[PDB]
Amino acid sequence: GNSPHELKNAAQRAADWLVERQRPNGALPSRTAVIESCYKGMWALHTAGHTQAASAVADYVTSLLQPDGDIPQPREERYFLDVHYLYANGYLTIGAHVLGRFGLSRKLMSFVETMRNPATGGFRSHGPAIPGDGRCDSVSTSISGLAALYTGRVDTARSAADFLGSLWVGQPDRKNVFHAVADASGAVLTSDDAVAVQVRKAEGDWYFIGLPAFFLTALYEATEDRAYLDLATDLMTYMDEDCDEDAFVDSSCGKAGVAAALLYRLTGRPRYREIAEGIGTLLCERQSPYGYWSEEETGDVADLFWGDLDMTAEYVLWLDLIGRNLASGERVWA
Amino acid sequence: SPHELKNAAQRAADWLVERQRPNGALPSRTAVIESCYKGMWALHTAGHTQAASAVADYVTSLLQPDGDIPQPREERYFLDVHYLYANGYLTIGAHVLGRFGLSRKLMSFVETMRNPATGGFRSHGPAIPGDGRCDSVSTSISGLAALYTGRVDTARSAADFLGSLWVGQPDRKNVFHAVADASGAVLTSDDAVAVQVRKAEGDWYFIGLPAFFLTALYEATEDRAYLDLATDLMTYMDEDCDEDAFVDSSCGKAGVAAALLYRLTGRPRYREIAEGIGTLLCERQSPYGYWSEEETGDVADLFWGDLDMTAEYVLWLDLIGRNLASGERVWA
């Protein structure tokens, strides 16, 4: 296994790669100019110490900001339209707030809450102009709840956890499928077109479970309400015993790993470090030597396809969070 | 150059991490909270997130059930001058790090010290003798901690105290009385903090830290009344205060305020103040990375005030550098 020192060095290598190729307007080196290519940029580069590069992304994001606090364009990927439209918005809010861009995050978080379903506590999956039926998913709700934490809107975070709690206990067939979406009225949306994770198979989408586990663990730390800890503990046990191991192998397993590392610092259970260390080590070995993570690229490239840039900035963040909670976990418990 | 200011901050952060204690404490010769209250925030901005979380672990083990850290404390200024100065940086550092339980409890206690009649924050801690007086530094850092934790109403109330303190100055061209009583009237007695604005006797951060907080509140709110008061305090330090206002060790607050004001307004005088202070702080840096007024050798620890100044300059040079680079870009 690799140590938190080595998980961190892998994070700083990718963060160096990004800063080397950042555009003068602040955009990260994406082959296509879309918001889903750099929405984790402010947060990731801040945790890596590249604050001027993170502030540059904040300048690029601010110049794209609409009067209502949203960035509806440039968007291309289908998932950032009607699957989890607020995935970009949630990371933008956290990254702007930790940077001290209080005007940016306040406007981003204001719009995020305009998407909240007051009847259920979830957040709408499709953007204002995107066709949809008002469905709310676990990813939009957990990332908005996490963004609610960093901005101090704890009541919104609490209402988001109620949605995830109701979504968990409403699972009709949890051993075979995880329905990560509810309709606009609070019922678990078991429709064919709704996101549903095939648990016993190896077909990705695990972060629809891992990100709620991350959010719920953070809200527990914020509140020490055991209801949030028990629900996060269930989701982790669910992904460990009931889920196919691809839940900890697929590219979206970093959310589970961050949650396990957080849970280890908060509980001291050794299996949480096991899941956290194995996931963090797994992502380290996949890193290209130039710093970036990618699926098809292997050479000294000057830019990346939008999915690889986002994955690269996402792994700077996940390896850092896992590394700092494993390090603090040993100090506290061991 | 924002590039050079950042490298100086990363060298001081490297110096701190290389000497951090196994329990998370920064290398202070005395185990006191005033030696490392800026450690969580400073190390996080430098990328040393494992070292920042270690400070969070050490701070967490000191937290009392009401959210304060009354011990270990030794410096009088962290007893009855601006007691909450330590708590303010602890709250911010804990929050940007994700330690929401640590930051919420710290912020909860800070708010119990707010004076609801004036919006100011009590200068002396619970155990410490005093008369309910509130100072501009306790109020500014509490307001900035409130902004980072989303307590905007508490921040707006802190600015109201600063605005009341400002227009209430009985003699601003000769002295800045930074304290008011519990009733809201400016305290002019000799025991109150008073900046002799025409003498090189330090304590300028009683004006500069208000200017920083008020500028950040303006960005959070776009209420130009906060920008105007921030502008008046920056003009006050530039034209009416001694040049030591931008030379004393406590000038980093005005520099960060100027760097932030430059990004928001674009007036190049704010860029001059930020660069001048930033390069000044850069030139005072020892080659090993730490900042000290006495030490020059390769030391394994520092006097608590030198260790705090070292972490403080990590943050200020980063803030000054990030706002000058972004200020250069938007006003290109």
Ligand SMILES: CC(=O)N[C@@H](C=O)[C@@H](O)[C@H](O)[C@H](O)CO
């Ligand atoms: C660099 C500097 O002069 N900083 C000032 C405030 O931040 C100073 O008052 C410090 O707090 C010092 O530890 C004494 O209190």
Ligand SMILES: O=C[C@H](O)[C@H](O)CO
């Ligand atoms: O890198 C992956 C992106 O987050 C998106 O989910 C596309 O797969």
Ligand SMILES: O=C[C@H](O)[C@H](O)CO
């Ligand atoms: O040690 C130097 C600090 O800046 C301060 O003077 C301590 O009181």
